[PDB]
Design a binder for these strands. Structure first.
Ligand SMILES: [Mg+2]
Ligand SMILES: [Mg+2]
Ligand SMILES: [Mg+2]
Ligand SMILES: [Mg+2]
Ligand SMILES: [Mg+2]
Ligand SMILES: [Mg+2]
Ligand SMILES: [Mg+2]
Ligand SMILES: [Mg+2]
Ligand SMILES: [Mg+2]
Ligand SMILES: [Mg+2]
Ligand SMILES: [Mg+2]
Ligand SMILES: [Mg+2]
Lengths: 148, 177, 85, 91, 120, 101, 99
RNA sequence: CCUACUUCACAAAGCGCCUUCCCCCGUAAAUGAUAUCAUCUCAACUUAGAUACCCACACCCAAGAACAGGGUU
RNA sequence: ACCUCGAUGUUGGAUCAGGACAUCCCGAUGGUGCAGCCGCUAUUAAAGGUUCGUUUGUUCAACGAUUAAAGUCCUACGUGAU
RNA sequence: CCGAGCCUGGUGAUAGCUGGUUGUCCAAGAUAGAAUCUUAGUUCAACUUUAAAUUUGCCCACAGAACCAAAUCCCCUUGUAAAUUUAACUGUUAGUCCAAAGAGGAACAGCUCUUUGGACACUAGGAAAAAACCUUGUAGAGAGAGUAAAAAAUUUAACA
């Protein structure tokens, strides 16, 4: 639900679109077992696709570890210190290309609820409403039942 | 525009004292306007949880004007919890006892039936006469317009208004009145 | 206000056909037009099969009338050609 | 009310507002225009006879033929051998 | 017993007051109907639900082209309280295979076979 | 829908737009443009030669996981689904206006 | 179950909240809500309720000009239906035909 | 409430004593139009038509289940 | 035969009664085949009141003596964790 | 704790009766009956389900179906896509209310019993709350939009 889960406002990291766009994903960390059916589609991802992925965005540095793991993981680390560890356990090569491309596309913000679908920081341009907009002044600033 | 954060925020949510004359006015049609300005439903910053109601001062609440025989037909009924304490009192008798409570019961019926209703009733000031205290007279900002245009009587039509209206019929010469 | 829009030849719902929902929502900044919207593709498939039904039914109507007229001319010639011998 | 408001002998009354009258009226007007456009067929019943017998026959040949072409799918060697890669290793 | 209902033929014989009210022509009538289901077939008998399935009117507020022939019109006379019937008028001609995709049926009842998105 | 938009702000959309993160977009179908002292509202849209609204794609996230539970009492009817929709965030970079009236 | 049935109520309560805000800020300019919405529809200015509530809060000159456009079109409807028969149409009463 | 009487006794009780304050609305009649008389008038209209009370440690108590209260000069 | 058969405990009485008025008494009026006194009938009024005994398990009924009157009912035939 | 002790055994007696029957997700799916020491149940049918073979199924137009009202049967076209048959069985077969035609009762009942059609046991909106009335069905997200049903109206007696 939304009352048990925390929420946040829709933001970016360092005004991520204004001047230039910066890839928010620093490191990927694959740990892939050499012998093991859990990390089969990980291995076929390293043999085929992790090199072309590593060239399609050079701001990401990638660490394939190749240790005897029993469940393979990928660890995305973001520019703001966020670390999202997701498992590639028994997933095919295409599903790891969509998973790794999903981690590449997003940012190090939490995946908790976002309150508003938008974020202006200058919401009002003609001046915000206060109760004395749309009220005409009177002569000498007089209020009702005031004589002088 | 171009304020700071806290003065803009204070300006948007500050509450406005209204004045509202109730001479020759029906109490429910005053209660509609008083109810709207007490909930903050006249603000586009309205939300039920932002606490954005205002203050409404209604003066001349002895000079309520019901339409029809509602002075003699409309019954205000209370029940003190004691057995046999069911007290049905017409609007005339209750207007003679406390000359505030007809407009007060009307507004209290108009407001949303929740816990903000009595806080909104404490932002409403009902005075039976012309006299309003000076600490409330120094708070008022706007006088809201009266929702019923009071019809004038024959002492109040001017002679050009009378002569502008035509004589419609000739009486006989020998007629006595 | 949809009865007014029916009076003006517009769609009754402003999200229906027209300029708000059938132009592309976005383009590249270079000037390249976007790939088409999924609902615009599905919708133009709906309008195309609708038009195909209009043409198909119209052709069955015209071929039906002309086939009836040829049956009536053959009945008239089977009336006339047996009036002898 | 005697019991269960809306069914029974003594039911509570319900009355027809101006909403419900205008709704029923505009439904009757749409209905009367349906009565207009059903009053003028483009063909008689003689003229329509058999004008779509060919297309209906071919349509049921398509449904009949889709019914009589139901059978188990093809079984391949590459699927069964393709299972063996569950123990694919590196070296 | 609530049974199926028959409708006599004088109900479906238009008058010149009706020919002037609605823009129809008794000589040279229209070929194609636009039919639109605008009343749910629930709380209706099963034969009406069946006719609404036979006419392809399962979704509401979706137009469907039918023929103006007495058999189709017999099915439309069964469910005439559930639908809306308009003539399919065609200002420009019925579309050729060149103009096949660039059509749009307007809310007036006309099928415009050259459909730009541009103002006049 | 209809997004009220300045420059330098953000919009969270609820679909993937088959675009790379960082690609510039010209938003067509603008339909009101205002400043402090004038506006420009078109019928229903504005001219593409009049208003140019630009926006980049920042991030193509998923939503927070979203539970879809159905439950009918005394009928043993209890279904749980968990759904994350895709989302893209757009940084509106500039609203440029063109003197064509 | 409340969490899923409250999505419909989220959409509903946002829309009635917007109609309250458009109602309040249009009462500030003398109009009412149905005159404002019906006569903004009749100008082919097809702004929705969310945008008009946000203009009602953050940009009230634009909302005042939309109120003058809607009341101008309302008076062109009054003078239009008043002088029946053929008369020249209103200036803001013209419609833009698309094809 | 206990002065007597009675059950009784450093008090509580009644069988004993003391105090107890406003109307009801149904009609009955004036003047008088609609309907120039008249007519009590779902005509305008005229008659018959609540105060009081309450309010700033410890020990004993007429206060009290505890707490609270009153008194301690 | 709709709730209750995995419990909604029964008539009278005691005790406390709450309510209705379609008023038995007390209050105010209209008519009367109303002289007065007693009556009869109708309008309004529910603030207050509405007895004790013999027989009977009796609510009832009869009887005895009074009373201003000894009301009609409803409240799970009010109320048995009183 | 004796209308026939208590213990062990047969004994895991038997129960048409009561209660319970534990992961996820999708799909199809509700109301003719006949027998029965039977109406608290079972068997067959009907309906439902899965697989399979085939070709017609549904709606229907002229014509047609008896003598002593609504309508139905039949039914080429047409609109459609389902139907029959084969294989395998389970389960439902203790229904309610409304509209209408009747029977019984009081021309009573939220009454009983038939028939035709809805609805509910399935979702949502309205009728105040609301199984059965009206609107509406095919499922998700949206801080978009157009609509559907939808708000009770009434105030009275002179007369020569
Ligand atoms: Mg009831
Ligand atoms: Mg029964
Ligand atoms: Mg029982
Ligand atoms: Mg009485
Ligand atoms: Mg009892
Ligand atoms: Mg008890
Ligand atoms: Mg057993
Ligand atoms: Mg049995
Ligand atoms: Mg299903
Ligand atoms: Mg038996
Ligand atoms: Mg047949
Ligand atoms: Mg029944």
């Amino acid at each position: 639900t939304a009352r048990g889960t925390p929420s946040r406002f829709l933001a970016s990291v360092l005004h991520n679109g204004l001047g230039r766009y910066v890839q928010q994903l620093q490191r990927l960390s694959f740990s892939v077992s050499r012998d093991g059916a859990s990390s089969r589609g990980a291995r076929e991802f390293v043999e085929r696709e992790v090199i072309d992925f590593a060239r399609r965005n050079p701001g990401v540095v990638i660490y394939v570890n190749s240790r005897p793991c029993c469940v393979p993981r990928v660890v995305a680390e973001y520019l703001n210190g966020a670390v999202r560890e997701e498992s590639i356990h028994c997933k095919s090569v295409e599903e790891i290309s969509t998973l790794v491309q999903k981690l590449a596309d997003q940012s190090g913000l939490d995946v908790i609820r976002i309150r508003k679908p938008f974020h202006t920081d200058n919401p009002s341009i003609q001046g915000q409403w206060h109760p004395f907009t749309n009220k005409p002044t009177t002569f000498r600033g007089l209020r009702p039942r005031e004589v002088q | 525009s171009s304020f700071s954060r806290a003065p803009q925020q204070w300006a948007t949510f500050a509450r406005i004292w209204y004045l509202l004359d109730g001479k020759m006015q029906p109490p429910g049609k005053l209660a509609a306007m008083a109810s709207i300005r007490l909930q903050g439903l006249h603000k586009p910053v309205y939300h039920a949880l932002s606490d954005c109601g205002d203050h409404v001062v209604i003066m001349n609440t002895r000079h309520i004007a019901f339409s029809g025989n509602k002075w003699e037909q409309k019954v205000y009924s209370s029940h003190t919890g004691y057995p046999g304490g069911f007290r049905q009192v017409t609007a005339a008798q209750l207007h003679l006892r406390d000359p505030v409570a007809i407009v007060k019961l009307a507004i209290y019926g108009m407001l949303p039936k929740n816990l903000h209703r009595r806080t909104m009733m404490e932002r409403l000031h009902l005075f039976p006469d012309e006299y309003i205290p000076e600490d409330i007279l120094k708070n008022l900002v706007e006088e809201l317009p009266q929702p019923r245009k009071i019809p004038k009587r024959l002492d109040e039509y001017t002679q050009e208004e009378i002569d502008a209206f035509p004589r419609l019929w000739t009486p006989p010469e020998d007629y006595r009145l | 206000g949809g009865q007014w829009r029916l009076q003006q030849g517009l769609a009754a719902n402003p999200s229906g056909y027209g300029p708000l929902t059938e132009l592309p929502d976005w383009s590249y900044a270079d000037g390249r037009p976007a790939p088409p919207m999924k609902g615009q593709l599905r919708r133009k498939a709906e309008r195309e099969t609708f038009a195909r039904r209009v043409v198909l039914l119209s052709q069955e109507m015209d071929a039906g009338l002309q086939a009836w007229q040829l049956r009536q001319q053959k009945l008239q010639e089977e009336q006339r050609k047996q009036e002898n011998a | 009310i005697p019991g269960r408001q809306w069914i029974g002998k003594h039911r509570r009354p319900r009355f027809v507002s101006l909403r419900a009258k205008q709704n029923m009226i505009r439904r009757l007007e749409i209905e009367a225009e349906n009565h207009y456009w059903l009053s003028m067929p483009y063909m008689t019943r003689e003229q329509e006879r058999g004008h779509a017998a060919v297309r209906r026959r071919e349509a049921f040949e398509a449904i009949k033929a889709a019914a009589t072409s139901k059978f188990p799918p093809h079984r391949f060697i590459a699927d069964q051998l393709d299972h063996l890669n569950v123990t694919k290793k590196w070296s | 017993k609530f049974t199926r209902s028959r409708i006599p033929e004088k109900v479906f014989q238009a008058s010149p007051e009706d020919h002037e009210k609605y823009g129809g022509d008794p000589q040279n009538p229209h070929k194609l109907h636009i039919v639109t289901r605008i009343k749910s077939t629930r709380r209706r008998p099963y034969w009406e639900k069946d006719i609404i399935k036979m006419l392809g009117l399962e979704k509401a507020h979706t137009p469907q082209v039918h023929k103006n022939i007495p058999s189709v019109n017999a099915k439309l006379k069964v469910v005439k309280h559930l639908i809306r019937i308009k003539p399919l008028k065609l200002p420009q001609g019925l579309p050729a295979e060149e103009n096949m995709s660039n059509t749009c049926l307007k809310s007036t009842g006309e099928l415009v076979v050259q459909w730009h998105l541009k103002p006049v | 829908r209809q997004w009220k938009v300045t420059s330098e702000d953000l919009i969270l959309i609820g679909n993937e737009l088959d675009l790379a993160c960082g690609e510039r977009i010209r938003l067509e179908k603008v339909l009101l443009v205002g400043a402090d002292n004038f506006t420009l509202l078109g019928k229903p849209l504005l001219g593409k030669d009049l208003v140019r609204v630009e926006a980049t794609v920042i991030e193509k996230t998923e939503s927070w996981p979203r539970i879809i539970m159905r439950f009918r009492k005394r009928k043993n009817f209890k279904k749980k689904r968990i759904v994350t929709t895709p989302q893209t965030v757009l940084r509106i970079n500039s609203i440029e206006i063109a003197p064509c009236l | 179950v409340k969490c899923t049935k409250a999505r419909y109520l989220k959409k509903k309560n946002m829309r009635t909240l917007w109609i309250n805000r458009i109602t309040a800020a249009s009462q500030e300019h003398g109009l009412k809500y149905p005159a404002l919405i019906g006569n903004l529809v009749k100008c082919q200015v097809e702004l929705n309720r969310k945008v008009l509530a946000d203009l009602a809060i953050y940009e009230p000159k634009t909302f005042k000009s939309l109120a003058a456009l809607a009341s101008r079109r309302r008076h062109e409807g009054f003078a239009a239906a008043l002088g029946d028969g053929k008369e020249p149409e209103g200036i803001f009463s013209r419609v833009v035909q698309y094809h």
